[PDB]
Amino acid sequence: GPPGPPGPPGPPGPPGPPGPPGP
């Protein structure tokens, strides 16, 4: 038989890093 279709998307990645200090 032919290959199966691609898998579904992975999970979201994690949160980005914190922002810089305030002014």
Supply the minimum distance, in Å, between the C-beta of residue 14 and a copy of itself. Answer: 5
Six-digit token string for 11:
């999970």
Return residues touching a copy of itself (CB under 8 A): 1-23
Amino acid found at 13: G
Supply the minimum distance, in Å, between the C-beta of residue 9 and a copy of itself. Answer: 5
What does the alpha-carbon distance between residue 20 and residue 23 come to, in Å, rounded to a whole number? Answer: 9
What does the alpha-carbon distance between residue 19 and residue 22 come to, in Å, rounded to a whole number? Answer: 9
Supply the minimum distance, in Å, between the C-beta of residue 3 and a copy of itself. Answer: 5
